[PDB]
Amino acid sequence: PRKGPAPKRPLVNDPVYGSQLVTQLVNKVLLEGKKSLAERIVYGALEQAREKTGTDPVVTLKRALDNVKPALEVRSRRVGGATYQVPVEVRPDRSTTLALRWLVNFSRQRREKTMVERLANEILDASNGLGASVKRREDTHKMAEANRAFAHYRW
Amino acid sequence: IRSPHKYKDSREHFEMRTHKRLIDILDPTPKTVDALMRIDLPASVDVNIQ
Amino acid sequence: GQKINPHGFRLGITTEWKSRWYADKQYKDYVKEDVAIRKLLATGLERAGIADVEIERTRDRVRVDIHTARPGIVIGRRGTEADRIRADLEKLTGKQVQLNILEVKNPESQAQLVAQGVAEQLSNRVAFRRAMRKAIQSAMRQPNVKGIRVQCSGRLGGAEMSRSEFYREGRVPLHTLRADIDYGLYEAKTTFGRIGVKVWIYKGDIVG
Amino acid sequence: AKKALVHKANKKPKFAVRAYTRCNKCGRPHSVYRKFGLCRICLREMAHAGELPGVQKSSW
RNA sequence: CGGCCAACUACGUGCCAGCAGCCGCGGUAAUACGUAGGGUCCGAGCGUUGUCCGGAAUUACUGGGCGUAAAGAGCUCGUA
RNA sequence: CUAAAACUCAAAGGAAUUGACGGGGGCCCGCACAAGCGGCGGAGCAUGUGGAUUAAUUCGAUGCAACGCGAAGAACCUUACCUGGGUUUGACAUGCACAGGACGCCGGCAGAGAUGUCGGUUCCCUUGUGGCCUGUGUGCAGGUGGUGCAUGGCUGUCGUCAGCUCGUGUCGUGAGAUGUUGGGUUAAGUCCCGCAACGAGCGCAACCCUUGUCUCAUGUUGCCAGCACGUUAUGGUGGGGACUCGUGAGAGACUGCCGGGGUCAACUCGGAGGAAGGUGGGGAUGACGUCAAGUCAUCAUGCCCCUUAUGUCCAGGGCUUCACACAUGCUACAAUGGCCGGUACAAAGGGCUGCGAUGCCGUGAGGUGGAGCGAAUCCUUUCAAAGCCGGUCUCAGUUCGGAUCGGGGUCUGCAACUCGACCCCGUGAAGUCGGAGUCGCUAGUAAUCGCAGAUCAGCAACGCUGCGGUGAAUACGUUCCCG
């Protein structure tokens, strides 16, 4: 990364739903090196959302993403022994990555004992704004317009 | 291990390769059997008969 | 420890093996016999520099090729010492050997012999720099050589301090696999201890 | 190892298990390959010297 | 009989005994210490010491210098 | 303010040159930070080290660059350490006599063993004596005894970082400089532009190995479509190089072409074709030098010390001791899971006093017995696990986890108590995802799952060296930390 920007990997389209969002989600939720379990988990969550909310999984997933997609983030930079939390706008790719990361991260702190309905429940909550990752999203926005005091450095 | 008495992270790999072929002769004309054992070969080559 | 042996670097590209035979069950016995006879040859004769010692062994037949500088010391007109080597091997029981001894046409262009000469001249309490001067001049006299590097390490001059000194001339491209680089190592015994002499001789490239 | 230890290794043990390798060229009991009878140091030295018919630098 | 400065090998001693005009030689291979051979310069003389001139353009009249090597007074006024 | 002498040294100084150094700067790189994934420090266990004990707990290693390191294998041996009993030209060699035809083998008794005593067996020359050794020495052999701040050889580190020089010319009175400085680019002193420099060597790159495509040759133990013979036991068999594969030879990647930036330049961005596009992926290869870096325990070696001993044989014991600390790993703390049943796909390697199969007997380590192989055949089962399917468990110190502990066994070894591994039953401790801090990694990579090998009779291997299966996130950018 010292010489120049790194190349970007291609994204394989999904054969079942035809959107890169589900394959990005299954990549993000992948753990320990087992794909098959990962797509079966995410497809089970999609089907439970299908049977629960009564609407299509793609539209509600995109709506949840919009409800979780942030616009500003916080970057720590040090000078003279003091670290300042400058607010910086976010590229769309980082916004989507952060949204998926937050969803999957708050997918694992539940008590309801299996992954598929955990994911389905948080998808429904994020669609309705009742989730936990959304709370962190408005928290990040709150510090975005809260920490405006350090912006003249422009780093 | 390259070094005597320590430096385990430095090492050297060696190989030993042996190449083998077969020649099967049909219809053993007796002159062939007479002249076969007389053939002298390089020391690096070993041949056995079955 | 930086450089690997140049002879061992090109053991399958430029240079060839030293001993050739085939064995599976008696491989260990064969190699132990090789080391025993090589130790005997190295220990026994030293007044005549031995360029190389190659061994060939098939069935009961054995033959030893001893490449030396001058064979007159190693083979007299009456052949006492050649038969002495034969009998010394016979006590070692290497069975029968077709003992062959060969002289070298260019003793000045052989790294091992040059190293032996430098070591003996250092044993004569001669200044090392003069010995390297004369060795480099004599080696570069021959036309086909293209480079030479000569290095000695030890207690040079009798001082109580380690010293390693190297003198070079021409091209000695060690990093090339297709370069016929002759490598010679030898040891000089002095009053203060040990001296190590290394010689690299570069004589053109080879193309297959 | 010592000369006496080398000879006692060469000597016939009175029990089957009292035998070990004891590399021929030097006498170093550790890291001895039974294929060659040479310890790792002497194996390396002779492999570089080209005195073992078949061994060579491995690269792949 | 190191180099200045014509003339080198062996034995004995090894930082001891000793040499030396300047720089310096002796701790096992000393052309430098002592003795033997050989050599060189002089020669009824040969060396050392003391004194003076030279080399010293190193008190510079012939024939030197003062930014940083030693050397411009802290600055002016003014008497011979 | 004016202003000496005795004494003492063989120099004190000025300018500039080449290195080294700075708790002096400026640029450029690197998983250095940042952006991410997974860990260590918390628990139990395996090793290694520090410290403490005793008879020894043999020795070496000691920031990076020691701490799963010498050691790729400590019950005796190993073993170099402690106790005790022998032995002296000795456990191992060579030379002389004084003396020789015996040493050398198989048993008996004593003895923990080493070792001591009896019983049977005794030399090939050819008389000069030698091949052999039996006592006394004579020369001595023996030191894992010391000095890696006297050494050779080998190795680590900066670091695969990009540097180290020369010939001719020119510039300086001269050491010397220039080239090698400046701008750009590159993985790079790789190359381009300008400039008193013009060129060339060792380093970079290429030559070597492996993987990715095609062509030719090629058929055994390998492949087996089209053919026949075999039918549940399978290329199994006669048979074909058609397809693989095995192993020899060759072609193919060169910024080769197009478009844009470019100094009509290096190079950079995108495209066309192609299996691969920008040194396609990865190895071996480690320049000049720094660290009095490590190793007299691989070996060799100058000097120093013992030599009836610090040499040498044997029996037992220790390196596995533990009130603690540190480091590297394994198992976990569970539902992305545990147990039960079914279900198919890898590679490489090894095998003679070894792989060892079918059957038989156990519940299981395993006992019987031996087919086929010195090995593309026979064994590692037609070779695995994760996978996929079906059942259950419905969240607890648990159907987790296995430590610790009692009992009964299997194997190897003369001998498993101190101190091997494995099997069966039973109890089932800590451990609820871990403070300050801190580590690894940029694509078949991280994350994992299994298999083989070396050392080895047996293993303490959760280590090391390799192979294969499934396979991600992120890099805006050099402000800060490190080299």
From Swiss-Prot, chain A:
Cellular component, GO annotation:
small ribosomal subunit
Q: Which UniProt keywords apply?
A: Ribonucleoprotein, Ribosomal protein, RNA-binding, rRNA-binding, tRNA-binding
Single Gene Ontology BP annotation: translation
Q: Which Pfam families match?
A: Ribosomal_S7
Which GO terms label this protein's molecular function in UniProt? rRNA binding; structural constituent of ribosome; tRNA binding
The source's superkingdom equals Bacteria
- Does the keyword Ribosomal protein feature in the UniProt annotation? yes
State the family named in the UniProt similarity comment for this chain: Belongs to the universal ribosomal protein uS7 family.
| Summary of subunit composition and partner proteins | Part of the 30S ribosomal subunit. Contacts proteins S9 and S11.
From the Swiss-Prot or TrEMBL record, give the protein name. Small ribosomal subunit protein uS7
Q: What is the organism of origin for this protein? A: Mycolicibacterium smegmatis (strain ATCC 700084 / mc(2)155) (Mycobacterium smegmatis)
Curated annotation (Swiss-Prot), chain B:
Briefly, what is this protein's role? Involved in the binding of tRNA to the ribosomes.
Assembly mode: Part of the 30S ribosomal subunit.
- Family, per entry: Belongs to the universal ribosomal protein uS10 family.
Name of the featured protein? Small ribosomal subunit protein uS10
* Taxonomic source organism: Mycolicibacterium smegmatis (strain ATCC 700084 / mc(2)155)
- Gene encoding it? rpsJ
Residues of the whole record sequence present: 52 to 101 of 101
Swiss-Prot record, chain C:
Alphabetically sorted, this entry's keywords are: Ribonucleoprotein, Ribosomal protein, RNA-binding, rRNA-binding
Q: What GO molecular-function term can you cite, just one?
A: rRNA binding
GO terms under cellular component: cytosolic small ribosomal subunit
Lineage: superkingdom: Bacteria
Positions of the KH type-2 domain: 37-105
A single GO BP: translation
Q: What does this protein do?
A: Binds the lower part of the 30S subunit head. Binds mRNA in the 70S ribosome, positioning it for translation.
Instruction: Quote the subunit structure annotation.
Output: Part of the 30S ribosomal subunit. Forms a tight complex with proteins S10 and S14.
Q: Which family does it belong to?
A: Belongs to the universal ribosomal protein uS3 family.
What's the further remark here? Answer: Binds 2-aminothiazole antibiotics, which are antitubercular agents.
- Name of the featured protein: Small ribosomal subunit protein uS3
Source organism per UniProt: Mycolicibacterium smegmatis (strain ATCC 700084 / mc(2)155) (Mycobacterium smegmatis)
Instruction: Give the stretch of the parent protein shown, with its full length.
Output: 2 to 209 of 275
Curated annotation (Swiss-Prot), chain D:
Q: Name one GO biological process term.
A: translation
Instruction: Reply yes or no: does the keyword Mitochondrion apply.
Output: no
Give me the gene this protein comes from: rpsZ
What organism does the record attribute this protein to? Mycolicibacterium smegmatis (strain ATCC 700084 / mc(2)155) (Mycobacterium smegmatis)
The Swiss-Prot or TrEMBL record describes its family as follows:
Belongs to the universal ribosomal protein uS14 family. Zinc-binding uS14 subfamily.
Protein role: Binds 16S rRNA, required for the assembly of 30S particles and may also be responsible for determining the conformation of the 16S rRNA at the A site.
Name the Gene Ontology molecular function terms of this record.
Answer: rRNA binding; structural constituent of ribosome; zinc ion binding
Q: What is this protein called?
A: Small ribosomal subunit protein uS14B
Q: Which SUPFAM superfamilies match?
A: Glucocorticoid receptor-like (DNA-binding domain)
Paste the cofactor note.
Binds 1 zinc ion per subunit.
